[PDB]
Amino acid sequence: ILHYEKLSKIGLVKGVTRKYKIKSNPLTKDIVIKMIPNVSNMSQCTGSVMENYKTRLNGILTPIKGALEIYKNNTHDCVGDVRLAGVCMAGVAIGIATAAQITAGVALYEAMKNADNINKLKSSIESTNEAVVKLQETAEKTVYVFTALQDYINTNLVPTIDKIPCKQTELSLDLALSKYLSDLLFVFGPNLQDPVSNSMTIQAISQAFGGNYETLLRTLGYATEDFDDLLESDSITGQIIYVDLSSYYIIVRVYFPILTEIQQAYIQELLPVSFNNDNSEWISIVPNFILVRNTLISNIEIGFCLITKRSVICNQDYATPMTNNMRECLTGSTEKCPRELVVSSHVPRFALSNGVLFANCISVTCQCQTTGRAISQSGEQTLLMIDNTTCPTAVLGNVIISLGKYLGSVNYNSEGIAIGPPVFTDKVDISSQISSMNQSLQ
Amino acid sequence: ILHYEKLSKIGLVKGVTRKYKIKSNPLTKDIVIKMIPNVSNMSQCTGSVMENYKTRLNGILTPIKGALEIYKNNTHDCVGDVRLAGVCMAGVAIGIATAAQITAGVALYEAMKNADNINKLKSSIESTNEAVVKLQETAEKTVYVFTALQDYINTNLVPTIDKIPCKQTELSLDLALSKYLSDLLFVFGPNLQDPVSNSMTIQAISQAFGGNYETLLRTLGYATEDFDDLLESDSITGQIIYVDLSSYYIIVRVYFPILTEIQQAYIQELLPVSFNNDNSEWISIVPNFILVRNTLISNIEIGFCLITKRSVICNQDYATPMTNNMRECLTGSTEKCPRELVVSSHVPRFALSNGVLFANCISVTCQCQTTGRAISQSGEQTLLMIDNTTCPTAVLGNVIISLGKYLGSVNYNSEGIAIGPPVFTDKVDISSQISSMNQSLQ
Amino acid sequence: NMRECLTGSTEKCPRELVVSSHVPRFALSNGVLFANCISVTCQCQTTGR
Amino acid sequence: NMRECLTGSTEKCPRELVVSSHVPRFALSNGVLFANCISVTCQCQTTGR
């Protein structure tokens, strides 16, 4: 549906084509993170820092449980075989809620059925003294405990409990806990206005475990070969389902989705190339990545998506609309495409697609090795296509390139196109332009 | 509500009030039933009956697999992103299907994911030679195998493999297999036209295991305290999800639900008592059991439901509509209540409710104890309430009973009511009455 | 009257009010789906609505 | 214009077409629900309809 020839003549050379996949069908695994370490082996002269850290952690964790109780008090199992018989919502007692928040609330109740069983293990969870521990939940089920600060204690403070003054061990400890809290406040501090939702990434959750999410995910298991993907695209998300203020440990349900490639849906990348026109260099302003699905053309906000070599991966359908004029431009109405005059000397001037070379030989010196003579671009040709018909080996500065054959029109370099109007894309330029048109209208 | 006082004079003495509960939220457990014994230890002179049993068995299991494959060849996971999660159905290739059939299909595909794991164990399943065997499909998931006649062969055939001429052993094994097949044909034979359904009771499924469902359910687990209830009301059901024509074994997903009390609903049982009118005995024709739900009164087809001392239990919402005239007859308008003349001499004539007894004092000897004088009923009073007001101990035939207070009107026995029209409830009487009224209309 | 009911005169086919919450509500014939969308929510995926 | 849009003149409130299958469709305010029941499954519990 994209017409590549006029795009190339404007300066949008073909790029890689990647499939579009989204997170889907999430499996669940439950774990607990003890945000307080066991200092039992080194409690002889820990001092009063333990109590002060206790109060600070209580102060931080209290709003989380307060927000959770809004759903906990208002979640109940509706009675009788008439409906799916799931959970009822005291909506008038909830007051303000979104679709995502309510959905998380339902998943929170669902997980309560297992969280009650894990909370039966409270004494075992308190007794944990290793940075990772596995516990039997049932004869057919298991749960993992992660200690926020057990590795540091067990590796440094316990071995060095006598070789230095104990007061110094007090400071070190205090400093370690304060460092934990400082790293924590970005995620578990007052920034966490909505702990109920499950949109929080496992990377953010691991901040409660010192930022080591690779241990969370390895201990739970590399369920699929796409693992690095669901990891980078922020597709692996977790939810806090129970907060305890006595043992200072939270239960997190980790979600491991599967990446569903969307059928009839591919992502196209366009390479911009500076082109000559009216004795100056210009670069067209079009989206680098375009999403074409069901013969429908729409943009994509790929900043939050992951662009691998073969697929574009998103934790959410990040498709966004595209202007009608942009659709006509990418369809072939090339005069509707905007262009920006380039004043930077560090803009790329040539690109290679399918082995055929598009270049601006006015801006960059081109000569062919086979014939030992310059390759000339005239003043009315925006870009020069070089392929094996032109000559099988051309150069561009310090690179020797060998080119394949073109698949489109044989007389490509002899046919011109129309060119659009200039644009300026600075933040203040938009305000400046809007004033000008408004004044012109008046 | 029900007007017990006006109903009592018609003969509808109040009875036990029972709660109403229905199966909901079924849990799923998976098992395999090997419809063929392992004859490995007796194979020395098993004869040729094994092959003929194989062919006869195949003749029964082939239609079941054929009906399942209408779904298996027409069931797959969709993208799951085009629309909220579900299972795709090739409906053009299915053709004819009910809602229940499609629901079973969905459950069938859903279970297929576990069924693939169980089938990965096919060699282990074939190797079973105990009547009950426990196996792993993974370290956190058990599965059970129940062989066909393994225990019987293990207990009487193998021990007697030499003490008698083993040609007689061949004959006895042939008879045993034929007995199994004859028992099976009631359920798994041509009557099983819809293996894609979860309405088949565990009692019927156990016929493949010799009718021994108690072993199925004990080995799987008595998870609830209402277990006998779920068992008798035909609430515990199972579905066949895999049929194998080479190892001759099926996989069944057994459902263990929980009984939900239908809130603001109860079942009232009415006792009939013969009463006088115009020098003859009559018994009213009304439903013995009435279902009142959310202040709405309706019949219940209670034949399939199970009646306990405290509640009425059904594997389905078996509520049925009720006539407007029955409504008015049950809420006070006794003139619309039906009545049937009693010709039989074995109709109950007195009943006891709340410690007071409503009796037919002329059709049965009716005297009091504390005075020695008889209790007389006039020809205008349909029934006589006898309570401790008239005397605290009454005699009826050979039973002497002590009676308590009455809670309703004090002057009950002095107030009469209107009486309805007679009816006849024979199957042929309905046709005769229809014909007579049709001829009367003409 | 039943014969006329099954041969197109649907006004003579008797009907019963529904009291069971477990009565069938959709059915599939010839790959064509007949359902009572008032009692069961219907939203096909291709229109997404 | 944005001010007017927020204080009643909804004809001045700009709108963008939806292309994300993951856009919010319902929201709870003051115990009362505002939802787009043509784009999402929508039924009542007390009547089943």
Swiss-Prot record, chains C, D:
- Show the disulfide pairing: 5-13, 37-42
Post-translationally, this protein is described as follows, namely:
The inactive precursor F0 is glycosylated and proteolytically cleaved into F1 and F2 to be functionally active. The cleavage is mediated by cellular proteases during the transport and maturation of the polypeptide.
Q: Subcellular localization, per the record? A: Virion membrane; Host cell membrane
- Family to which this protein belongs: Belongs to the paramyxoviruses fusion glycoprotein family.
What quaternary structure, including any partners, is listed in this protein's UniProt entry? Homotrimer; disulfide-linked F1-F2. Interacts with the Glycoprotein G; this interaction involves both head and stalk regions of glygoprotein G. In pre-fusion state, found as a dimer of trimer.
Function (record text): Class I viral fusion protein. Under the current model, the protein has at least 3 conformational states: pre-fusion native state, pre-hairpin intermediate state, and post-fusion hairpin state. During viral and plasma cell membrane fusion, the heptad repeat (HR) regions assume a trimer-of-hairpins structure, positioning the fusion peptide in close proximity to the C-terminal region of the ectodomain. The formation of this structure appears to drive apposition and subsequent fusion of viral and plasma cell membranes.
Q: What is this protein called?
A: Fusion glycoprotein F0
- Lineage of this protein's species? Viruses, Riboviria, Orthornavirae, Negarnaviricota, Haploviricotina
